Curated annotation (Swiss-Prot), chain A:
Disorder: Weaver syndrome: A syndrome of accelerated growth and osseous maturation, unusual craniofacial appearance, hoarse and low-pitched cry, and hypertonia with camptodactyly. Distinguishing features of Weaver syndrome include broad forehead and face, ocular hypertelorism, prominent wide philtrum, micrognathia, deep horizontal chin groove, and deep-set nails. In addition, carpal bone development is advanced over the rest of the hand.
SUBUNIT field: Component of the PRC2/EED-EZH2 complex, which includes EED, EZH2, SUZ12, RBBP4 and RBBP7 and possibly AEBP2. The minimum components required for methyltransferase activity of the PRC2/EED-EZH2 complex are EED, EZH2 and SUZ12. The PRC2 complex may also interact with DNMT1, DNMT3A, DNMT3B and PHF1 via the EZH2 subunit and with SIRT1 via the SUZ12 subunit. Interacts with HDAC1 and HDAC2. Binds ATRX via the SET domain. Interacts with PRAME. Interacts with CDYL. Interacts with CLOCK, BMAL1 and CRY1. Interacts with DNMT3L; the interaction is direct.
Induction of its expression: Expression is induced by E2F1, E2F2 and E2F3. Expression is reduced in cells subject to numerous types of stress including UV-, IR- and bleomycin-induced DNA damage and by activation of p53/TP53.
Subcellular location: Nucleus
Protein's name according to its UniProt entry: Histone-lysine N-methyltransferase EZH2
Chain's gene name: EZH2
From Swiss-Prot, chain C:
Positions of crosslink type Glycyl lysine isopeptide (Lys-Gly) (interchain with G-Cter in ubiquitin): 1
Tissues in which the protein is found: Expressed in neuroblastoma cells.
Protein name in UniProt: Histone-binding protein RBBP4
Pfam families per the UniProt record, alphabetical: CAF1C_H4-bd, WD40
List of residues that carry N6-acetyllysine: 1, 145
Annotated phenotype, changing residue 164 to A: Loss of interaction with ZNF827 and loss of localization to telomeres
Lineage: Eukaryota, Metazoa, Chordata, Craniata, Vertebrata
Keywords: Acetylation, Cell cycle, Chaperone, Chromatin regulator, Chromosome, DNA damage, DNA repair, DNA replication, Isopeptide bond, Nucleus, Phosphoprotein, Repeat, Repressor, Telomere, Transcription, Transcription regulation, Ubl conjugation, WD repeat
Region Interaction with ARMC12: start-end pairs: 1-117
Chief place of localization: nucleus
Phosphoserine modified-residue sites: 95, 340
From Swiss-Prot, chain D:
Protein name from the UniProt record: Zinc finger protein AEBP2
Membership in a protein family: Belongs to the AEBP2/jing C2H2-type zinc-finger family.
Biological classification of the source: Eukaryota, Metazoa, Chordata, Craniata, Vertebrata
Stretches with biased composition (Basic residues): 1-15
Function in brief: Acts as an accessory subunit for the core Polycomb repressive complex 2 (PRC2), which mediates histone H3K27 (H3K27me3) trimethylation on chromatin leading to transcriptional repression of the affected target gene. Plays a role in nucleosome localization of the PRC2 complex.
Region called Interaction with SUZ12, residue ranges: 30-101
Location in the cell: Nucleus
Gene assigned in the entry: AEBP2
UniProtKB/Swiss-Prot annotation, chain E:
Triggers of expression: Expression is induced by E2F1, E2F2 and E2F3.
Native source organism of the sequence: Homo sapiens (Human)
Gene Ontology cellular-component annotations: chromatin silencing complex; ESC/E(Z) complex; nuclear body; nucleolus; nucleoplasm; nucleus; protein-DNA complex; ribonucleoprotein complex
Assembly and interaction partners: Component of the PRC2 complex, which consists of the core subunits EED, EZH1 or EZH2, SUZ12, and RBBP4, and various combinations of accessory subunits including AEBP2, JARID2, PHF19, MTF2 and EPOP. Within the complex, interacts (via C2H2 zinc finger domain) with JARID2 and EPOP; JARID2 and EPOP compete for SUZ12 binding. Also interacts with AEBP2 and PHF19. Forms a monomeric PRC2.2 (class 2) complex consisting of at least SUZ12, RBBP4, AEBP2 and JARID2.
Signal peptide (UniProt feature, chain positions): none
UniProt gene name: SUZ12
Protein name according to UniProt: Polycomb protein SUZ12
UniProt keyword annotation of Hydrolase present: no
GO biological process: one example: facultative heterochromatin formation
Length: 57, 58, 395, 126, 193, 243, 362
């Protein structure tokens, strides 16, 4: 998602780089997880062009 | 083959007409040879959902 | 088989019925509140005491329920729900933290045939079970969290019925007096107020043997402690009075309908009015003075009914729901009133409102005091429905 | 959310959530309705909201006076119960049309069981 | 393109809604008169102050106006059968469906018979009476549906009572047709003695 | 006039059989606003729009491509086998579900210009992550489907253990059970392995006797102190548990 | 060798046809019925005298717009009723019992298209399916439970299509486009334990859901057999036959000549190549051949409709004395071939919805 409730940050632990995942905001039961792939916008529509959220006004 | 001898097998049964499904499709299976072309009504199969495609992994 | 085939077709139709109702629900109902339970509860009831938080629209309400299961452990459950007292405050109405939760669970035996609280002491309730003993609990004494030991503590339970049954009614005046019915064709009475530390199982105070068939309903008079009546599958409701010598001969009796009758309800405001439903898609009413003559009948139901009760703060409103997945509201002041043909094509003038928004069958529906227009209902699909009708129907 | 709008705030496009209805039951319902229309003519003669009743006389009744009465019957045989009408009413009630809302309570199951199926179908439980 | 395939996509939604209307107009999901945008239906105000004790007096007058009684012990004569062999008559009782059964029960009893000649047209014989007692009962009819009658020679049926608590038949003359397994028919008249 | 559209490739139109009358539900709308509201609600399987006429009213309709037509009950019912789906003959365990759809009805005034879901809990069924199988609600808790060490890794590594040639079997098996117990618990720090060896030696010390690797294991422990990872007395206690 | 095209039929659907199977699970005197699956149609036919083939019951997948790919007959011991399971592009298993008119057991859980349907020789309740998800998941039909899955993480990195039970259901040989020649032993003591509890598991007895085993270690693997896409392999007793796009027929056995299949280890890598019945003009994959009931008579189709027939007598690929039958009309594309439960009747199916029947001049 472009504005997901969860993000991705590489961490560095015990001599082995790994990638930890953490929620951006408070989450309740049953919410589906999303995180930004950090691809190019051309690649975004090429791969992940679905976001499923319009503007309210 | 010995057990095949023992296991009794029900012979095939032919199709019968359906009064509630008289609108079903009918296919006339052609015979390439001199034998007459044979027709039989179709039967709709079961409806099941679908799971999105994925690859085995552990 | 064709019977099984048409049942499968009905499942699509039943699904379509829910779709039609749900789309039209926001524009016909002023309140929508649905909750799904993990296990069925045969009976549910609002606790009489309700608190409204200051400056908060979501009023603190709570419900008493049972549990039914296939082979697992059943629990006596009390759940609380927050409902908006003010509509002007637009989650969609309150916080995103939710407004309904579960707080109480107590180990239960079988399934709750019937459960009600003492009017003089709502903390104490009596639970009907498939077992002959009527389990009695006090949720204040018992712990809120369910006990995984599996042991149950129905302290001061009631004995006297040989087998199980349906029917439960506390005495509004006599403290600790309750009438129950069973398949024994007998009615058992208890006096909780007089129970000593006798052994945690109370025997029946008085046993009546009036009906010749399985008695399924019995109720005290909402204004009189002496007067009470019972109904059975004999299709004939039976009227009793205390101290009336033999417990097998009635004070009065009359046949109710052409099929089974298993629901009774006294008018809390009019001393004279009795309204009774029936299994033959009919709900009727009679008078204490006039038993031989039926005042009026209701027929808009489509199938069996066994739930009737009288609306609070509204003497003119009676509602009933049955196995037809339909709930019908009737206006007593509108009986026989002239109406337009477009009104006649929809229903009789006495018919007030119809609600059927639920997939599975409903066997219980209940409102609460201080809320005359909202009713909770119990569906077979574990769905708890809370809804309030638009004011435009009643001005 | 005080600014919350109507229910349509979900998406602009999404994959199909799959339909609950089946094609084979549609054909059965169609043929069930076809024969239903052949005896009730809802779609043809009733314009989808009425049913035609073709009169038939079972018995002729004569009184002491000139009152001659006929017990009417109608073709569908899931009709209202037979009623007595005079000979003057014959040739007038030969084709009776009744709206759906005026149909008797019992006739609802007679025309089509699928109008309301009592899903218990038996006393499995209460 | 062709509208046949254009329609073809649309019958399935159309036929469903055609089937929904038939069910909904018989078994509604909601009241059409509670609709806000069609408020002309049920436009009357709800007067809750209306008293309800008057129902006893109002309905008491209804019973006084609607007091019912029937003649007593049916009787009937026999009259010539018409067709291009003896005849038998049967009486049947109908009861409503209870909780446990799948369908309403029906029970039959034999009421009598008569030596009907072979299609007696006119001037056939020198007058025969079938006696019926108080087999019908208002108390029983409160518990079961209205009774009916069967005729055998060849089948026929005839019902005696209605749900309106009024007697359908009377001392008039009656000619009932006959089916098998216009046409065969039987003639008689009714009285009370 | 009622217009039917299929991508405009093929088109059909009809004319009103009297005004303000529903074609499908046969309801006498008697109002233009009532007619539009009835169509939008009673017939969500279709779509309804207003396209105007020289008289003033014309309707164009089409099939709802994204129609919400689907089962709304228990999601587990659909995947049940026929004859068991829609049983409705007993209690069924399902996660608690709560939705709110009406905070306050708008009750706005009728107007032509008026035209052109507070869910909570679980909504949909979840599948077994291990095998793409339907997971019943009765196990929303034991369904971790994961532990300190998935099984196939164990068989994967031991196969690689026997790959090496320059290691004798007696000193090859000591590789196995050591690494297996480590991945059994997933130690990370120096404090653990000093405790872990004592945990290990009691765990399988009897098994050490049967396989006759007691002395080979001693050399392993010798290498441990060479790695500064073990203390002096920890060697002593191992022999005490060993014998 | 002695054969002639006695009957020929053609489906009016004109759709490409797929796997065809014969009711080997029969009795003496039972109707000689074989089955056929098209894109969405499933059908059966019975061979008769004088080349007669009367049409039998045929159903249609009017809902799933997908191409059926594999099918295989099924037996029920409970009702003694024959059945048949089918699958295709969607990879969902439909097993229809002709006696009951319909299918009741539905199997979903596989991913992409299923390309193998073939039952255990001993237990009809056991069916291992192979699909494009590289899964060797097996279903216990009678219990409707998942059974231990082969392959997986260490299995085929590519799609698998071909799998075979041996004569006793001792081991399962399989391969796909990967060119990896892997087999798994059924006689592994662990899996029968799962098999035993599989036959009597009930989720209603305990909350604990069934635990299918996952297996990632073949008894042997190799990829030196074919440099082109292998599309067919079958159990030749103790030997392994293979077919590929290269128009060459290669049977082989693991390791050396003296190396037994059951005695071999997963670590083995040697192969003994012995098959030399090469052919031509059938360079396309997805072909499937068949064998007689007694493992005696071999017949192979062709893309050009020709027949490639062989025997398992003393005739061996040392000289490969072939018998290449050919029908002038049958020349478009042979999709599937299937022997009857005899050496006399054979059913050949062309891609152009046409069926060609050949009978032996015995």
């Amino acid at each position: 998602s472009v504005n997901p409730n969860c993000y991705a940050k590489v961490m560095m632990v015990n001599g082995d780089h790994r990638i930890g995942i953490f929620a951006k905001r408070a989450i309740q039961t049953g919410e589906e997880l999303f995180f930004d792939y950090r691809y190019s916008q051309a690649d975004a529509l090429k791969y992940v062009g679905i976001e499923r959220e319009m503007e309210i006004p | 083959n010995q057990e095949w001898k023992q296991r009794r097998i029900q012979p095939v049964h032919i199709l019968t007409s359906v009064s509630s499904l008289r609108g079903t499709r009918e296919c006339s299976v052609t015979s390439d040879l001199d034998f007459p072309t044979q027709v039989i009504p179709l039967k709709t199969l079961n409806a099941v959902a679908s799971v999105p495609i994925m690859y085995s992994w552990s | 088989k064709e019977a099984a085939f048409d049942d499968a077709v009905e499942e699509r139709v039943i699904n379509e019925e829910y779709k039609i109702w749900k789309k039209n629900t926001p524009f016909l109902y002023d309140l929508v509140m649905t909750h799904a339970l993990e296990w069925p509860s045969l009976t549910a009831q609002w606790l009489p005491d309700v608190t409204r938080p200051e400056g908060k629209d979501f009023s603190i309400h709570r419900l008493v329920l049972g549990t039914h299961t296939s082979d697992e452990q059943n629990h006596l459950v009390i759940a609380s729900v927050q409902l908006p007292n003010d509509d002007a405050q637009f989650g969609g109405f309150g916080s995103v933290s939710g407004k309904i939760e579960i707080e109480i669970k107590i180990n239960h035996e079988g399934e709750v045939n019937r459960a009600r609280y003492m009017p003089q002491n709502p903390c104490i309730i009596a639970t009907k079970t498939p077992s002959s003993d009527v389990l009695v609990f006090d949720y204040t004494k018992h712990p809120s969290k369910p006990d995984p030991s599996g042991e149950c503590n129905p302290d001061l339970r009631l004995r006297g019925h040989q087998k199980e049954g349906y029917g439960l009614s506390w005495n509004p005046n006599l403290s600790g007096h309750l009438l129950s019915a069973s398949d024994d064709h007998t009615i058992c009475l208890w006096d909780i107020s007089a129970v000593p530390k006798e052994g945690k199982v109370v025997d029946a105070k008085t046993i009546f043997t009036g009906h010749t068939a399985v008695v399924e309903d019995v109720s005290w008079h909402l204004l009189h402690e002496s007067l009470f009546g019972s109904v059975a599958d004999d299709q004939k409701l039976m009227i009793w009075d205390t101290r009336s010598n033999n417990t097998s001969k009635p004070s009065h009796s009359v046949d109710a309908h052409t099929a089974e009758v298993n629901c009774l309800s006294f008018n809390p405001y009019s001393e004279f009015i009795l309204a009774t439903g029936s299994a033959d898609k009919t709900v009727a009413l009679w008078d204490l003075r006039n038993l031989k003559l039926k005042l009026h009948s209701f027929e808009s139901h489509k199938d069996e009914i066994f739930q009737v009760q009288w609306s609070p703060h509204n003497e003119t409103i009676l509602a009933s729901s049955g196995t037809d997945r339909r709930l019908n509201v009737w206006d007593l002041s509108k009986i026989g009133e002239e109406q337009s043909p477009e009104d006649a094509e929809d229903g009789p003038p006495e018919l007030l409102f119809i609600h059927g928004g639920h997939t599975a069958k409903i066997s219980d529906f209940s409102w609460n005091p201080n809320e005359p227009w909202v009713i909770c209902s119990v569906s077979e699909d574990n769905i708890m429905q809370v809804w309030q009708m638009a004011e435009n129907i009643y001005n | 959310n005080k600014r919350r709008k109507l229910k349509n705030k979900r998406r602009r496009s999404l994959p199909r959530p799959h339909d609950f209805f089946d094609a084979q039951t549609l054909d059965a319902i169609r043929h069930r309705a076809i024969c239903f229309n052949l005896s009730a003519h809802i779609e043809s003669l009733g314009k989808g909201h009425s049913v035609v009743f073709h009169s038939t006389v079972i018995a002729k009744r004569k009184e002491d006076s000139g009152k001659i009465k006929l017990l009417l019957h109608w073709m569908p045989e899931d009709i209202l119960p037979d009623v007595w009408v005079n000979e003057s009413e014959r040739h007038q009630l030969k084709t009776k049309v009744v709206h759906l809302s005026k149909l008797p309570k019992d006739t609802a199951l007679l025309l089509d069981p699928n109008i309301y199926r009592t899903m218990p179908q038996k006393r499995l439980k209460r | 393109a062709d509208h046949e395939l254009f329609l073809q996509a649309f019958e399935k939604p159309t036929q469903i809604y055609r089937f929904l209307r038939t069910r909904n107009l018989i078994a509604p999901i909601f009241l059409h008169r509670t609709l806000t945008y069609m408020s002309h239906r049920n436009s009357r105000t709800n007067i809750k102050r209306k008293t309800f004790k008057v129902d006893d007096m109002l309905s008491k007058v209804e019973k006084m106006k609607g007091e019912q009684e029937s003649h007593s012990h049916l009787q009937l004569t026999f009259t010539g059968f018409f067709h291009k062999v003896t005849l038998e008559v049967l009486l049947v009782k109908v009861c409503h469906k209870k909780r446990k059964d799948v369908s309403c029960p029906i029970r039959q009893v034999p009421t009598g018979k008569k030596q009907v000649p072979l299609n007696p047209d006119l001037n056939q014989t020198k007058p025969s009476l079938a006696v019926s007692s108080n087999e019908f009962e208002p108390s029983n009819s409160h518990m079961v549906k209205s009774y009916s009658l069967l005729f055998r020679v060849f089948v026929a049926q005839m019902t005696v009572f209605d749900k309106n608590r009024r007697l359908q038949l009377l001392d008039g003359e009656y000619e009932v047709a006959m089916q098998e397994m216009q046409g065969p028919t039987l003639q008689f008249t009714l009285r009370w003695t | 006039f009622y217009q039917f559209l299929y991508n405009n490739n093929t088109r059909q139109q009809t004319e009103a059989r009297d005004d303000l009358h529903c074609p499908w539900c046969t309801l006498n709308c008697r109002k233009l606003y009532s007619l539009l509201k009835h169509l939008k609600l009673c017939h969500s399987r279709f779509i309804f729009n207003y396209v105007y006429h020289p008289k003033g009213a014309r309707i164009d309709v089409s099939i709802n491509e994204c129609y919400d037509g689907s089962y709304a009950g228990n999601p587990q019912d659909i995947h049940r086998q026929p004859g068991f789906a829609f049983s409705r003959n007993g209690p069924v365990k399902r996660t608690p579900i709560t939705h709110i759809l009406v905070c306050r009805p708008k009750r706005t005034k009728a107007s032509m210009s008026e035209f052109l879901t507070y869910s909570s809990g679980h909504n949909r069924l979840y599948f077994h992550s291990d095998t793409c199988l339907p997971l019943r609600p009765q196990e929303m808790e034991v369904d971790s489907e994961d532990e300190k060490d998935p099984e196939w890794l164990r068989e994967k590594t031991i196969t690689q253990i026997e790959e090496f040639s320059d290691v004798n079997e007696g000193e090859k098996e000591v590789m196995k059970l050591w690494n297996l117990h480590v991945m059994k618990h997933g130690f990370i720090a120096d404090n653990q392995m000093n405790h872990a060896c004592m945990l290990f030696v009691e765990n399988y010390g009897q098994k050490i006797i049967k396989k006759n690797l007691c002395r080979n294991f001693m050399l392993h422990l010798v290498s441990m102190h060479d790695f500064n990872l073990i203390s002096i007395m920890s060697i002593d206690k191992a022999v005490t548990k060993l014998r | 060798y002695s054969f002639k095209c006695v009957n020929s039929l053609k489906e009016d659907h004109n759709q490409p046809l797929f796997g065809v199977q014969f009711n080997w699970h029969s009795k003496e005197g039972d109707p000689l019925v074989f089955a056929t699956v098209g894109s969405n149609r499933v059908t059966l036919y019975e061979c008769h005298s004088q080349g007669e083939i009367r049409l039998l019951q045929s159903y249609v997948d009017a809902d799933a717009d997908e191409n059926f790919y594999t099918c295989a007959w099924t037996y029920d011991s409970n009702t003694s009723h024959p059945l048949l399971a089918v699958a295709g592009s969607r990879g969902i298993i439909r097993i229809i019992n002709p006696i009951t008119m319909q299918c009741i057991k539905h199997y979903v859980g596989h991913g992409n298209a299923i390309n193998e349907l073939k039952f255990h020789p001993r237990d009809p309740n056991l069916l291992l399916s192979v699909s494009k998800d590289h899964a060797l998941r097996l279903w216990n039909i009678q219990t409707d439970t998942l059974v231990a899955i082969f392959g997986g993480v260490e299995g085929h990195r590519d799609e698998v299509l071909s799998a075979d039970y041996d004569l006793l259901g001792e081991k399962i040989m399989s391969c796909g486009m990967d060119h990896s020649l892997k087999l798994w032993r059924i006689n592994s003591k662990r899996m029968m334990n799962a098999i035993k509890e599989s036959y009597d598991y009930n989720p209603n007895k305990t909350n604990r859901p069934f635990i299918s085993q996952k297996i990632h270690f073949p008894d042997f693997s190799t990829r030196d057999i074919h440099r082109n896409y292998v599309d067919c392999v079958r159990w030749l007793g103790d030997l392994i036959l293979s077919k590929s796009c290269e128009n060459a027929i290669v049977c082989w056995k693991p390791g050396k000549m003296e190396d037994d299949i059951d005695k071999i280890k997963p670590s083995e890598s040697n192969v003994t190549i012995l098959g030399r019945f090469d052919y031509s003009q059938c360079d396309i994959w997805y072909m499937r051949f068949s064998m007689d009931f007694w493992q005696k008579m071999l017949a192979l189709g062709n893309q050009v409709g020709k027949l490639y027939v062989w025997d398992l007598e003393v005739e061996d690929p040392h000289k490969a004395k072939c018998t290449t039958l050919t029908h002038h009309k049958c020349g478009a594309a042979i999709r599937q071939t299937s022997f009857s439960r005899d050496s006399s009747i054979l059913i050949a199916v062309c891609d152009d919805a046409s069926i060609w029947r050949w009978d032996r001049l015995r």
